[PDB]
């Protein structure tokens, strides 16, 4: 996240940290995700596309730091990894970039609720906030586009939803953005999501609830003028989500 403040997971109790194991001893961060129900985390297909070996990923709930432990955290294995059929990427955008991970603990259980572990709410069929709404994004991704390391502390920031009309302006992303994506930026192009934030959540309040309105997906640069962050429009995938989380 470029800008933003540092937070603790108590302020984002639905955020999940997904890591990959390597033979040699290291586990590296892959992407963020969010918990929808006790056994399901939702993230982005492009985070698993180049290495769809579920047994090699570890999911952690209740984590405020990247490589150190947080008391209360829970570790899970990926029981089912569901990527999106029709996922495609072009020179920038990812289409249908949503993925689901069913988690199982070594004792055979799913997540349990605490002050550091909570689910986030889904929107209702194709229902979104109106452009202008302030939503917050969170994650462990880059702090500057030039960095080559990720922060050790969780970060958060607030961005506003913009319209498709504004995003599809030729000098923004033109037709690369579709009806199944959402764009969010800071009025003064100062804070944004960046590499390392993929799969994490875009939360806004809808009809009273804190709802997962978007998934960090792509963007040209980080916090660049007229280059909003693009998110997967969760409200348009509810059928798909249901199809697997039944």
């Amino acid at each position: 996240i470029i800008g933003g403040e540092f937070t603790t997971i108590e302020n984002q109790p639905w955020f999940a940290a997904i890591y990959r194991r390597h033979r040699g001893g290291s586990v590296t961060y892959v992407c963020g995700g969010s918990l929808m129900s006790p056994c399901w985390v939702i993230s982005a297909t492009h985070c698993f596309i180049d290495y769809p070996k579920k047994e090699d990923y570890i999911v952690y709930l209740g984590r405020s730091r990247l490589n150190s432990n947080t008391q209360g955290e829970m570790k899970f294995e990926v029981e089912n990894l569901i990527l999106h059929k029709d996922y495609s990427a072009d020179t920038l955008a990812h289409h249908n970039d949503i993925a689901l991970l069913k988690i199982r603990s070594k004792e055979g259980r799913c997540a349990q609720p605490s002050r550091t572990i909570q689910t986030i709410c889904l929107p209702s069929m194709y229902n979104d906030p109106q452009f202008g709404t302030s939503c917050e994004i969170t994650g462990f991704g880059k702090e500057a586009s030039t960095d080559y390391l990720y922060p050790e502390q969780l970060k958060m920031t607030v961005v506003k939803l913009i319209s498709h009309r504004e995003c599809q302006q030729p000098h923004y992303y033109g037709s690369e953005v579709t009806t199944k994506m959402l764009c969010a930026a800071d009025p003064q192009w100062k804070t944004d999501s960046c590499q390392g934030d993929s799969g994490g959540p875009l939360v806004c309040s809808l009809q009273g609830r804190m709802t997962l309105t978007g998934i960090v997906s792509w963007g040209r640069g980080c916090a660049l003028k007229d280059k909003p962050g693009v998110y997967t429009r969760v409200s348009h995938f509810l059928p798909w989500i249901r199809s697997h989380t039944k």
């Binding site: 108590e10 302020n11 984002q12 109790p13 639905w14 129900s37 006790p38 609720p113 002050r115 909570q118 689910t119 986030i120 709410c121 609830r209 804190m210 709802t211």
Partner: peptide
Amino acid sequence: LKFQCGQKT
């Protein structure tokens, strides 16, 4: 106690 989506405590 149990999950209540969207609630921070």
